[PDB]
Amino acid sequence: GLPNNTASWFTALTQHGKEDLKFPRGQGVPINTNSSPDDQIGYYRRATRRIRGGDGKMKDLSPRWYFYYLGTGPEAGLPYGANKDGIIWVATEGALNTPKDHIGTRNPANNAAIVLQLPQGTTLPKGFYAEGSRGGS
Known part of the structure:
Protein backbone atom coordinates (compact mmCIF):
# COMPACT_ATOMS: atom_id res chain seq x y z
CA GLY A 1 0.00 0.00 0.00
CA LEU A 2 2.88 2.35 0.75
CA PRO A 3 3.95 4.85 -1.95
CA ASN A 4 6.86 4.49 -4.37
CA ASN A 5 9.36 6.07 -1.98
CA THR A 6 11.54 3.37 -0.43
CA ALA A 7 15.34 3.43 -0.29
CA SER A 8 18.02 1.27 1.33
CA TRP A 9 19.20 2.38 4.77
CA PHE A 10 22.75 1.76 3.55
CA THR A 11 24.55 2.29 0.25
CA ALA A 12 24.33 -0.17 -2.64
CA LEU A 13 26.76 -2.57 -4.32
CA THR A 14 28.07 -2.43 -7.89
CA GLN A 15 28.86 -5.56 -9.89
CA HIS A 16 32.06 -5.70 -11.94
CA GLY A 17 32.30 -9.37 -12.90
CA LYS A 18 30.51 -12.59 -13.78
CA GLU A 19 29.78 -13.34 -10.12
CA ASP A 20 26.18 -12.81 -9.04
CA LEU A 21 27.11 -11.70 -5.52
CA LYS A 22 27.03 -14.26 -2.71
CA PHE A 23 27.88 -14.30 1.00
CA PRO A 24 28.32 -17.13 3.54
CA ARG A 25 26.01 -17.77 6.50
CA GLY A 26 26.51 -15.07 9.12
CA GLN A 27 28.03 -12.56 6.71
CA GLY A 28 27.07 -10.04 4.05
CA VAL A 29 25.07 -7.68 6.25
CA PRO A 30 26.73 -4.28 6.87
CA ILE A 31 27.40 -2.73 10.27
CA ASN A 32 24.34 -1.00 11.73
CA THR A 33 24.94 1.24 14.74
CA ASN A 34 21.44 2.72 14.80
CA SER A 35 19.79 -0.70 14.93
CA SER A 36 19.58 -3.98 16.85
CA PRO A 37 21.50 -7.23 16.23
CA ASP A 38 18.28 -9.20 15.78
CA ASP A 39 17.36 -6.79 12.99
CA GLN A 40 20.58 -7.46 11.08
CA ILE A 41 18.79 -9.68 8.56
CA GLY A 42 17.38 -9.26 5.06
CA TYR A 43 18.06 -9.82 1.37
CA TYR A 44 19.72 -8.13 -1.60
CA ARG A 45 17.79 -7.11 -4.71
CA ARG A 46 18.94 -5.48 -7.95
CA ALA A 47 17.35 -2.18 -8.99
CA THR A 48 17.35 -0.28 -12.29
CA ARG A 49 16.43 3.39 -12.74
CA ARG A 50 17.00 6.19 -15.24
CA ILE A 51 18.63 9.42 -14.06
CA ARG A 52 19.07 12.73 -15.88
CA GLY A 53 22.24 12.64 -17.96
CA TRP A 65 22.42 -4.40 -5.45
CA TYR A 66 20.38 -2.88 -2.63
CA PHE A 67 19.79 -4.34 0.84
CA TYR A 68 16.72 -4.02 3.05
CA TYR A 69 15.40 -5.58 6.26
CA LEU A 70 12.99 -8.52 6.02
CA GLY A 71 9.35 -7.76 5.27
CA THR A 72 10.39 -4.52 3.57
CA GLY A 73 11.33 -3.16 0.16
CA PRO A 74 10.07 -4.72 -3.09
CA GLU A 75 10.80 -8.34 -2.16
CA ALA A 76 8.79 -8.15 1.06
CA GLY A 77 6.74 -11.03 2.43
CA LEU A 78 9.33 -13.77 2.03
CA PRO A 79 10.37 -15.81 5.10
CA TYR A 80 14.02 -16.69 5.71
CA GLY A 81 14.92 -19.66 3.53
CA ALA A 82 12.37 -19.05 0.78
CA ASN A 83 14.16 -19.63 -2.53
CA LYS A 84 14.06 -16.92 -5.20
CA ASP A 85 16.23 -16.18 -8.23
CA GLY A 86 17.80 -12.73 -8.29
CA ILE A 87 17.50 -12.46 -4.52
CA ILE A 88 20.19 -13.23 -1.94
CA TRP A 89 19.65 -14.30 1.67
CA VAL A 90 21.75 -12.41 4.22
CA ALA A 91 21.92 -12.67 8.01
CA THR A 92 24.38 -11.82 10.79
CA GLU A 93 25.15 -13.66 14.03
CA GLY A 94 22.18 -13.21 16.35
CA ALA A 95 20.00 -11.80 13.58
CA LEU A 96 16.37 -12.88 13.97
CA ASN A 97 14.51 -14.36 11.00
CA THR A 98 11.43 -12.13 11.08
CA PRO A 99 9.81 -9.22 9.19
CA LYS A 100 10.87 -5.77 10.40
CA ASP A 101 7.78 -3.85 9.29
CA HIS A 102 8.00 -1.61 12.36
CA ILE A 103 11.33 -0.41 10.96
CA GLY A 104 10.58 -0.30 7.25
CA THR A 105 12.82 1.45 4.73
CA ARG A 106 14.35 4.93 4.64
CA ASN A 107 13.00 7.50 2.19
CA PRO A 108 15.67 9.20 0.04
CA ALA A 109 13.93 12.57 0.28
CA ASN A 110 13.86 12.38 4.08
CA ASN A 111 17.35 10.95 4.51
CA ALA A 112 20.26 9.38 2.63
CA ALA A 113 21.90 5.95 2.69
CA ILE A 114 24.68 5.19 5.17
CA VAL A 115 28.11 4.00 4.03
CA LEU A 116 27.93 0.21 3.81
CA GLN A 117 30.71 -1.32 5.91
CA LEU A 118 30.96 -5.05 6.58
CA PRO A 119 32.06 -6.35 10.01
CA GLN A 120 35.60 -7.48 10.80
CA GLY A 121 36.46 -10.78 9.12
CA THR A 122 33.83 -10.28 6.42
CA THR A 123 34.81 -9.38 2.86
CA LEU A 124 32.82 -8.59 -0.28
CA PRO A 125 32.72 -11.03 -3.22
CA LYS A 126 35.42 -10.86 -5.90
CA GLY A 127 34.35 -8.34 -8.52
CA PHE A 128 32.21 -6.22 -6.21
CA TYR A 129 32.54 -3.02 -4.17
CA ALA A 130 30.68 -0.61 -1.90
CA GLU A 131 29.06 2.65 -3.00
CA GLY A 132 30.19 5.82 -1.27
CA SER A 133 32.66 4.02 0.99
CA ARG A 134 36.37 4.03 0.18
CA GLY A 135 37.20 0.39 0.86
CA GLY A 136 37.55 -2.10 3.70
CA SER A 137 40.83 -3.24 5.22
Whole structure:
Protein backbone atom coordinates (compact mmCIF):
# COMPACT_ATOMS: atom_id res chain seq x y z
CA GLY A 1 0.00 0.00 0.00
CA LEU A 2 2.88 2.35 0.75
CA PRO A 3 3.95 4.85 -1.95
CA ASN A 4 6.86 4.49 -4.37
CA ASN A 5 9.36 6.07 -1.98
CA THR A 6 11.54 3.37 -0.43
CA ALA A 7 15.34 3.43 -0.29
CA SER A 8 18.02 1.27 1.33
CA TRP A 9 19.20 2.38 4.77
CA PHE A 10 22.75 1.76 3.55
CA THR A 11 24.55 2.29 0.25
CA ALA A 12 24.33 -0.17 -2.64
CA LEU A 13 26.76 -2.57 -4.32
CA THR A 14 28.07 -2.43 -7.89
CA GLN A 15 28.86 -5.56 -9.89
CA HIS A 16 32.06 -5.70 -11.94
CA GLY A 17 32.30 -9.37 -12.90
CA LYS A 18 30.51 -12.59 -13.78
CA GLU A 19 29.78 -13.34 -10.12
CA ASP A 20 26.18 -12.81 -9.04
CA LEU A 21 27.11 -11.70 -5.52
CA LYS A 22 27.03 -14.26 -2.71
CA PHE A 23 27.88 -14.30 1.00
CA PRO A 24 28.32 -17.13 3.54
CA ARG A 25 26.01 -17.77 6.50
CA GLY A 26 26.51 -15.07 9.12
CA GLN A 27 28.03 -12.56 6.71
CA GLY A 28 27.07 -10.04 4.05
CA VAL A 29 25.07 -7.68 6.25
CA PRO A 30 26.73 -4.28 6.87
CA ILE A 31 27.40 -2.73 10.27
CA ASN A 32 24.34 -1.00 11.73
CA THR A 33 24.94 1.24 14.74
CA ASN A 34 21.44 2.72 14.80
CA SER A 35 19.79 -0.70 14.93
CA SER A 36 19.58 -3.98 16.85
CA PRO A 37 21.50 -7.23 16.23
CA ASP A 38 18.28 -9.20 15.78
CA ASP A 39 17.36 -6.79 12.99
CA GLN A 40 20.58 -7.46 11.08
CA ILE A 41 18.79 -9.68 8.56
CA GLY A 42 17.38 -9.26 5.06
CA TYR A 43 18.06 -9.82 1.37
CA TYR A 44 19.72 -8.13 -1.60
CA ARG A 45 17.79 -7.11 -4.71
CA ARG A 46 18.94 -5.48 -7.95
CA ALA A 47 17.35 -2.18 -8.99
CA THR A 48 17.35 -0.28 -12.29
CA ARG A 49 16.43 3.39 -12.74
CA ARG A 50 17.00 6.19 -15.24
CA ILE A 51 18.63 9.42 -14.06
CA ARG A 52 19.07 12.73 -15.88
CA GLY A 53 22.24 12.64 -17.96
CA GLY A 54 24.85 15.36 -18.29
CA ASP A 55 23.96 16.26 -21.87
CA GLY A 56 20.40 16.78 -20.70
CA LYS A 57 18.83 13.55 -21.92
CA MET A 58 17.91 10.98 -19.26
CA LYS A 59 20.30 8.02 -19.15
CA ASP A 60 19.51 4.57 -17.77
CA LEU A 61 21.86 4.03 -14.82
CA SER A 62 23.46 0.61 -14.37
CA PRO A 63 21.83 -1.91 -11.99
CA ARG A 64 22.89 -1.97 -8.34
CA TRP A 65 22.42 -4.40 -5.45
CA TYR A 66 20.38 -2.88 -2.63
CA PHE A 67 19.79 -4.34 0.84
CA TYR A 68 16.72 -4.02 3.05
CA TYR A 69 15.40 -5.58 6.26
CA LEU A 70 12.99 -8.52 6.02
CA GLY A 71 9.35 -7.76 5.27
CA THR A 72 10.39 -4.52 3.57
CA GLY A 73 11.33 -3.16 0.16
CA PRO A 74 10.07 -4.72 -3.09
CA GLU A 75 10.80 -8.34 -2.16
CA ALA A 76 8.79 -8.15 1.06
CA GLY A 77 6.74 -11.03 2.43
CA LEU A 78 9.33 -13.77 2.03
CA PRO A 79 10.37 -15.81 5.10
CA TYR A 80 14.02 -16.69 5.71
CA GLY A 81 14.92 -19.66 3.53
CA ALA A 82 12.37 -19.05 0.78
CA ASN A 83 14.16 -19.63 -2.53
CA LYS A 84 14.06 -16.92 -5.20
CA ASP A 85 16.23 -16.18 -8.23
CA GLY A 86 17.80 -12.73 -8.29
CA ILE A 87 17.50 -12.46 -4.52
CA ILE A 88 20.19 -13.23 -1.94
CA TRP A 89 19.65 -14.30 1.67
CA VAL A 90 21.75 -12.41 4.22
CA ALA A 91 21.92 -12.67 8.01
CA THR A 92 24.38 -11.82 10.79
CA GLU A 93 25.15 -13.66 14.03
CA GLY A 94 22.18 -13.21 16.35
CA ALA A 95 20.00 -11.80 13.58
CA LEU A 96 16.37 -12.88 13.97
CA ASN A 97 14.51 -14.36 11.00
CA THR A 98 11.43 -12.13 11.08
CA PRO A 99 9.81 -9.22 9.19
CA LYS A 100 10.87 -5.77 10.40
CA ASP A 101 7.78 -3.85 9.29
CA HIS A 102 8.00 -1.61 12.36
CA ILE A 103 11.33 -0.41 10.96
CA GLY A 104 10.58 -0.30 7.25
CA THR A 105 12.82 1.45 4.73
CA ARG A 106 14.35 4.93 4.64
CA ASN A 107 13.00 7.50 2.19
CA PRO A 108 15.67 9.20 0.04
CA ALA A 109 13.93 12.57 0.28
CA ASN A 110 13.86 12.38 4.08
CA ASN A 111 17.35 10.95 4.51
CA ALA A 112 20.26 9.38 2.63
CA ALA A 113 21.90 5.95 2.69
CA ILE A 114 24.68 5.19 5.17
CA VAL A 115 28.11 4.00 4.03
CA LEU A 116 27.93 0.21 3.81
CA GLN A 117 30.71 -1.32 5.91
CA LEU A 118 30.96 -5.05 6.58
CA PRO A 119 32.06 -6.35 10.01
CA GLN A 120 35.60 -7.48 10.80
CA GLY A 121 36.46 -10.78 9.12
CA THR A 122 33.83 -10.28 6.42
CA THR A 123 34.81 -9.38 2.86
CA LEU A 124 32.82 -8.59 -0.28
CA PRO A 125 32.72 -11.03 -3.22
CA LYS A 126 35.42 -10.86 -5.90
CA GLY A 127 34.35 -8.34 -8.52
CA PHE A 128 32.21 -6.22 -6.21
CA TYR A 129 32.54 -3.02 -4.17
CA ALA A 130 30.68 -0.61 -1.90
CA GLU A 131 29.06 2.65 -3.00
CA GLY A 132 30.19 5.82 -1.27
CA SER A 133 32.66 4.02 0.99
CA ARG A 134 36.37 4.03 0.18
CA GLY A 135 37.20 0.39 0.86
CA GLY A 136 37.55 -2.10 3.70
CA SER A 137 40.83 -3.24 5.22
